[PDB]
Amino acid sequence: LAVIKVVGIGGGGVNAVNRMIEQGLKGVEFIAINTDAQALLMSDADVKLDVGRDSTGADPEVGRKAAEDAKDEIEELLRGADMVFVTAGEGGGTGTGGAPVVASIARKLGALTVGVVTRPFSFEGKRRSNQAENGIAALRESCDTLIVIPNDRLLQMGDAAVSLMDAFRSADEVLLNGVQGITDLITTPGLINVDFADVKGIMSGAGTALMGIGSARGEGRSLKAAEIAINSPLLEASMEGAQGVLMSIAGGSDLGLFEINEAASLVQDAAHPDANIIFGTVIDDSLGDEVRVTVIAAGF
Amino acid sequence: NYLAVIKVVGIGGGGVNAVNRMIEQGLKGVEFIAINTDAQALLMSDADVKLDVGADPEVGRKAAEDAKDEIEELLRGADMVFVTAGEGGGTGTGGAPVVASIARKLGALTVGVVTRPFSFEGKRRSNQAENGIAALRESCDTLIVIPNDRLLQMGVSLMDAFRSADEVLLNGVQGITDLITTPGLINVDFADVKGIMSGAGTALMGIGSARGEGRSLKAAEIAINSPLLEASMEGAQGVLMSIAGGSDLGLFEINEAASLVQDAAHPDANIIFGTVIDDSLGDEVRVTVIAAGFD
Ligand SMILES: Nc1nc2c(ncn2[C@@H]2O[C@H](COP(=O)(O)OP(=O)(O)O)[C@@H](O)[C@H]2O)c(=O)[nH]1
């Protein structure tokens, strides 16, 4: 029985986590870390830590110092976790600076440490994009796996008439997608069981990674969802280059092995010839006639 | 004066986190108080009462001392106060002795719970772990010391080690409070608990669990021999034992467990014995033994 903790650090990460709770992500403890006591009052995370109270504003250095000052505190909150996720929106001060610290503390404790962060949209300014660049380099060193989701690419998906708040709600969703895609294999498996040891085996020290999501209904759903996942703009066409791929397919209890397999086979065929691919399934009884496929691609 | 008022104070990062666990597990019958002692960080809490008085013990000590009146008003009217800094060090280790002294001067039965870190954790300068214990020992009626090293002889990986420490910590409070607050076939008189705990000094704890036939005896045997007890059962002058179980828990089996602790305890020992009804345990029995004093 694995203990999984998901940490949302910074305003973006704390919003992603709330979205995760609101969408019903199960079998994980949620921890919100931020430098603003108000925003935290609003979070529905299980643990809420307010850091850098004296210091405190989009300065990654302030946020690193604020997490580092609270290092013992954070470590006490994490202690006992087999798996730790660190989600944030790269670019600001709290998530950018703080994320690597929370990651390093989890990795030091020997928890499978997975980072799940977004790159800011280009329209947000070259200062943020730069700070996210440095943020992700640091975070990379602290995580077993770091999935980086480029927000610009999210605009090539969903609606073409999306406002600025919906854009960021899509960022929340996709961060949920990345966490759920993995944790659900462990907490609520289907016919094909991929357990903590398995996920640990493929994602330990796998490095930098991208994700692809796809979903569909009705005839040929599993092939359709797999195909969308593998061609996802978030994967940045780098699928056929990946050395390690974890693939999760979720559907109701009625999800048969034939469909599972079809998706699996399509994915294999698009994958690198020497690719280590693990296929797992998820029971999710809320999905109806829909299946969703998540692909995590690493080792380029 | 007739429904024990029990106040559980978690102080510092590790203390509040322990209290939040207690709320999360559904610990009944007690009032929860969260005291943040750090200036730079606040761990939030769903505790009934919260006081933010904010990695040095000295810093915790002063901030607790500065807030002594507020703390005293928070503790006024309690019959029993628990105080813990939980796992990890920090300012809470400094603040704990203060809350404890305030509670004792108010005339409450003051029980501290403290943990000794795993040796693999290393040590921070000035022996501040051992000093936090000595200061808390001077301020408490009874200090329950949990030596985490002993956990690695119970039943272990690193994540289990840490999770076990948290679980036994919660039990250092729940084991005794449940006895007091939650009915069972054999109930205890608070005045007795106060009799064996008042000015008792250091105490150690032992836990045990078993299912099926001979469960009460098996769990009590595990609890009485617990490595956490550091075999202090022999010399112990004051012993509390509690058996938590479902409603069907038989008087005979209950009595066999009580008999066994009496044989194992020192001849001159005070023994307070009782059961708890917890219908969520199923076929399981959980025993807790608190051993205080020496021969
Ligand atoms: N997922 C998500 N990302 C956001 C949200 N708001 C802002 N962001 C992104 O997160 C980046 C950092 O902002 P924020 O997390 O508020 O900064 P911080 O709190 O100082 O780390 C921004 O540049 C955006 O790309 C949000 O509501 N949800």
Side-chain angles (χ1 to χ4, degrees), chain A residues 205-219:
Chain A
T208 184
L210 308 161
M211 64 165 304
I213 45 154
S215 54
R217 308 176 186 261
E219 184 122 20

Side-chain angles (χ1 to χ4, degrees), chain A residues 1-3 5 37 40 46-56 66 69-73 75-77 79-82 108-112, chain B residues 12-14 17-18 20-21 24 36 38-46 52 54-55 86-88 118 121 124 148 157-160 162-163 165-166:
Chain A
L1 191 43
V3 173
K5 298 180 178 153
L40 288 172
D46 308 290
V47 179
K48 300 171 222 170
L49 187 63
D50 185 24
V51 304
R53 299 210 289 178
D54 293 322
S55 92
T56 86
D69 287 354
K71 83 162 144 203
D72 301 341
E73 202 136 15
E75 185 183 318
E76 209 276 322
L77 287 178
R79 254 158 70 127
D82 300 288
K108 185 182 75 159
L109 299 163
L112 178 60
Chain B
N17 189 35
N20 290 335
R21 193 182 244 87
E24 168 71 37
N36 206 79
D38 302 302
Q40 290 298 352
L42 163 77
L43 176 57
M44 294 188 33
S45 174
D46 292 329
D52 182 358
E87 317 281 348
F118 287 99
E121 284 176 78
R124 309 287 176 95
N148 292 343
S157 92
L158 183 59
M159 288 71 185
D160 299 301
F162 290 131
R163 291 193 289 262
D166 290 333

Side-chain angles (χ1 to χ4, degrees), chain B residues 6 17 59 75 82 108 111 114 119 123 134 149 160 172 174 176 185 187 191 206 216 223 244 260 276 279 291:
Chain B
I6 307 170
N17 189 35
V59 184
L75 304 174
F82 284 86
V111 182
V114 71
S119 292
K123 202 153 150 179
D149 275 336
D160 299 301
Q174 192 183 2
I176 306 165
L185 175 61
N187 299 295
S216 284
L260 164 69
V276 172
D279 275 314

Side-chain angles (χ1 to χ4, degrees), chain B residues 1-27 29-57 59-104 106-124 127-137 139-217 219-294:
Chain B
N1 305 304
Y2 293 85
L3 201 66
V5 175
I6 307 170
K7 281 174 189 183
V8 186
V9 180
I11 183 156
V16 174
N17 189 35
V19 164
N20 290 335
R21 193 182 244 87
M22 289 174 204
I23 293 156
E24 168 71 37
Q25 313 282 16
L27 179 63
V30 300
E31 181 193 313
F32 294 115
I33 298 165
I35 310 194
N36 206 79
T37 41
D38 302 302
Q40 290 298 352
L42 163 77
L43 176 57
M44 294 188 33
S45 174
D46 292 329
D48 304 300
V49 189
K50 302 172 231 202
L51 175 77
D52 182 358
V53 307
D56 211 286
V59 184
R61 210 206 81 250
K62 293 192 193 151
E65 285 300 347
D66 291 351
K68 64 192 205 356
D69 296 355
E70 285 67 43
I71 300 172
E72 177 175 353
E73 287 320 299
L74 284 183
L75 304 174
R76 156 153 300 104
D79 295 285
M80 195 178 205
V81 168
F82 284 86
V83 182
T84 186
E87 317 281 348
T91 44
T93 75
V98 179
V99 184
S101 83
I102 291 177
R104 229 194 6 178
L106 279 185
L109 175 63
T110 302
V111 182
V113 187
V114 71
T115 65
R116 283 172 177 296
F118 287 99
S119 292
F120 63 71
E121 284 176 78
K123 202 153 150 179
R124 309 287 176 95
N127 213 15
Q128 70 165 48
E130 185 57 50
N131 305 321
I133 293 170
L136 202 44
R137 221 208 317 277
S139 325
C140 284
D141 277 310
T142 294
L143 178 49
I144 300 173
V145 170
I146 299 159
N148 292 343
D149 275 336
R150 294 307 184 154
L151 292 174
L152 311 171
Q153 317 164 203
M154 290 186 24
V156 188
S157 92
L158 183 59
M159 288 71 185
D160 299 301
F162 290 131
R163 291 193 289 262
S164 310
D166 290 333
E167 287 170 43
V168 312
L169 180 64
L170 163 88
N171 211 149
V173 172
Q174 192 183 2
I176 306 165
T177 66
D178 272 358
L179 190 60
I180 292 180
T181 72
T182 314
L185 175 61
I186 313 298
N187 299 295
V188 306
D189 198 332
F190 179 70
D192 282 8
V193 179
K194 188 179 174 72
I196 79 174
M197 294 188 86
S198 301
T202 288
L204 299 166
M205 166 185 63
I207 59 147
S209 267
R211 279 193 201 263
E213 204 197 292
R215 50 188 194 169
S216 284
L217 264 183
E221 186 80 65
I222 298 162
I224 286 142
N225 290 284
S226 191
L228 267 174
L229 274 175
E230 308 202 303
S232 63
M233 194 60 204
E234 257 192 309
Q237 282 319 276
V239 180
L240 213 101
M241 166 172 179
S242 183
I243 303 179
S247 320
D248 67 336
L249 200 67
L251 185 63
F252 178 84
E253 79 179 303
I254 280 168
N255 199 55
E256 277 175 312
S259 191
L260 164 69
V261 69
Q262 276 199 38
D263 291 352
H266 185 95
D268 304 321
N270 280 107
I271 310 163
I272 291 327
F273 175 89
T275 65
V276 172
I277 289 176
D278 177 353
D279 275 314
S280 76
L281 296 171
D283 173 22
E284 202 189 1
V285 160
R286 313 173 160 166
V287 179
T288 297
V289 167
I290 307 286
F294 73 92

Side-chain angles (χ1 to χ4, degrees), chain A residues 6-18 20 31-34 63 84-103 114-121 124 128 131-132 135-136 139 143 145-151 154 168 170-176 178-179:
Chain A
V6 177
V7 172
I9 183 152
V14 171
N15 290 337
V17 163
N18 273 7
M20 292 177 203
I31 300 173
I33 306 171
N34 208 356
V84 181
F85 288 77
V86 185
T87 58
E90 293 288 341
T94 303
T96 310
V101 178
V102 183
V114 176
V116 187
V117 302
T118 55
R119 239 157 186 136
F121 300 100
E124 294 189 58
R128 296 195 164 243
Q131 289 177 162
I136 291 171
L139 195 47
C143 290
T145 282
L146 174 57
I147 303 164
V148 184
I149 301 156
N151 279 349
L154 280 173
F168 280 133
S170 288
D172 288 342
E173 179 75 7
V174 75
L175 287 160
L176 161 56
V179 166

